[PDB]
Amino acid sequence: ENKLGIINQLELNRVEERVSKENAKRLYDSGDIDRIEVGTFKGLSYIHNYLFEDIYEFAGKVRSQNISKGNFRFAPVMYLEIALEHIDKMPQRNLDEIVAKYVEMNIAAPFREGNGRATRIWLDLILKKELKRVVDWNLINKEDYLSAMERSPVKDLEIKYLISNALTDKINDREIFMKGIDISYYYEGYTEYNVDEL
Amino acid sequence: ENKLGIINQLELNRVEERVSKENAKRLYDSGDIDRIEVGTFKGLSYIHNYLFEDIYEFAGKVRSQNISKGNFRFAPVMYLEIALEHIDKMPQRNLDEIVAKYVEMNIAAPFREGNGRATRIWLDLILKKELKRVVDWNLINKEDYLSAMERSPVKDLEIKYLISNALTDKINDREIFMKGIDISYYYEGYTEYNVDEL
Amino acid sequence: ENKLGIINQLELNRVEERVSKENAKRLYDSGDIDRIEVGTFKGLSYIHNYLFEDIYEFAGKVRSQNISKGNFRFAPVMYLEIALEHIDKMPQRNLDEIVAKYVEMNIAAPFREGNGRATRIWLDLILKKELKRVVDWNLINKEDYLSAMERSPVKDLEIKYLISNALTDKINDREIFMKGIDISYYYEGYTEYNVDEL
Amino acid sequence: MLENKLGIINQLELNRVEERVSKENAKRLYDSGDIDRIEVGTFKGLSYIHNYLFEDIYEFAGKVRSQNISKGNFRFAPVMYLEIALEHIDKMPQRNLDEIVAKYVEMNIAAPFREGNGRATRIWLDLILKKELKRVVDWNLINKEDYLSAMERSPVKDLEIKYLISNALTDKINDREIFMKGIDISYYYEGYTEYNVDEL
């Protein structure tokens, strides 16, 4: 279900990876990433549209159906408008409040697809603005990340620990961002490209 | 925080069990249980107030704070009004729909405390009206019940199975109701009294 | 790490699917599938080797290190032989005992890879011998299957329900088998081929 | 319901007497100084603790179980692995908090006795911490719900229970009140609240 002419899911995986990773590279290199609202659904939507507007019509738009990914209980549509407004007002002064806000937005998962990758970019911008840190994503193991996120609605200690131990002060390091993009796509199983070669 | 003069949590547990079980016995014997709206938040609120109004000021009222217990998130206050209106509109024609409705009201957990006991009484009333059955709670083990309830937000098959294999047609049997009250309190850890001896 | 020199994971996935599916087709059509020990590790090892001896060494052989999948707690290597001996002696007289045996063998997961596909074939042979049934895998939705398997060490009701509702007496229906092979590969994410065209 | 050395046929009364008698034994275990002459960190020592607490009540006290036991959200070790599992736990290191918590988590999964594993193993844990870190747990600093949730999570990831333990560590390793309060809280974790050990 896409804007390109793709009827095969494996081909769509490769093409989505390549086009959206191209867009992520441009998001950083043009400086556009630094002109978006931080910590808000408007900003998250801007990121998501930027990554995916060529591939999906729903890019940047709040979904209309429920989503089902494993046994994780995402927000049902009926709470979604309420949830995002709540998240727009949550504080983000320190690591606890930032992780708590990230966990709430992960539960809300407002888009049909692409929530994890877009929201990881959004999280790094919150960390940069409020703590002058970003996540070095090579300091977070993939299985530990996925397990910690699935656990996070009950207790966010695991995800907090991973993030806190992966914090770096190199908030303008192009290499940290670009490799963070490759790792973020690897978490969701897309590994056909390296973003820096696009 | 209670209407009595109690500073000890264990004494509060003791008196809460005794008073609310006395009220449950009266709810059945007076016939008041037969005059309640079935399957709605209005009826559930009536039950909860009836059990707990001597002990807690919030009895029968939707909570204003979040509650956090076990391995899945109950509805946060900000969703509660939407959730209860939705639950009022859910169907209750067969066991599948009754169990799905019970699972959603358990997730809603609209009161500050006492959700489990009130909602089990409420469930028996839905079963009595729509299937001419009640639950024989002596046919549901505590460990099995708790495990199945914790699983139900993901998949209600386990709780559906326990409930259906405990269904009895003795829907006016006083002793089934009374033992059901003692068992329902045992599920939550209250065992100091026997309801028929109160 | 494989018998061909394939260094790309997406490439290996393609050839592993096609070759091993050819071996599965031959396993059924040659009738060899009917002369393998039913319900024992020896029989499972024969199935696994038959599927994977062309692609992987160690095919049919007990793994030597621990394996992980998500948070699932598979048997550690140091207990594996004990587990396999225990599983060889588990009974298989009715559906309950067969599902329980299948759940223990899923936990044992004795091979480095290919446990799910080999063990699903092994399960169908146990069912055919003991109940004169096989599973119509078309009646078991994928997400329901994976969730049920993850749940099964705690409570095997979900997988038992899915299997019990997918049982067919068409134990010589060649397409039920071959489609079962395609669906079983889809469970693990291999979707490039239809075995009957191989 | 379990066979017991008293003539008790009602589970609620067995709960009451078990709580009373075994809490009495725990008080005497500490006050007699016997707790200081137990092997630390091995199944032999845990077995000694368990027998001390429960031998008046249960024949199986201090003994490896012969059947599986099943509760909660993860499988305890099955009997067929139990001897090997305990042998392994005996050899696990305990030099720092990470290793002690990992060892405690493995022993909680092993759950070698028919019943009473949680209470005996918490005493066993405190003795390990006292020997290797010169700390014990101030159990008043670990909430019940937090404790139980962290334990259920621990076979997957021991971070939550490690956090609770480390943030409750105290150096008062000979404070009798810390111990006695720990006994009452440890029994509260499992739902036994009819007595206070110091009032026994």
Author numbering:
A (entry chain C), B (entry chain A), C (entry chain D): 10 to 207
D (entry chain B): 8 to 207
Publication excerpt:
The most frequent PTM reaction catalyzed by FIC enzymes is the addition of AMP using ATP as a cofactor, coined AMPylation or adenylylation. Enterococcus faecalis FIC belongs to class III FIC proteins, which are comprised of a single FIC domain and carry an autoinhibitory glutamate in their C-terminal α-helix. We discover that EfFIC has both AMPylation and deAMPylation activities borne by the same active site. Furthermore, the conserved glutamate implements a Ca2+-controlled metal switch that tunes the balance between these activities without conformational change.
We determined crystal structures of unbound, phosphate-bound, AMP-bound, and ATPγS-bound wild-type EfFIC (EfFICWT) and of unbound and sulfate-bound EfFIC carrying a mutation of the catalytic histidine into an alanine (EfFICH111A). All EfFIC monomers resemble closely to each other and to structures of other class III FIC proteins. Mutation of the catalytic histidine (H111A), of the metal-binding acidic residue in the FIC motif (E115A), or of the inhibitory glutamate completely impaired deAMPylation of AMP-FAMEfFICE190G (mutant panels).
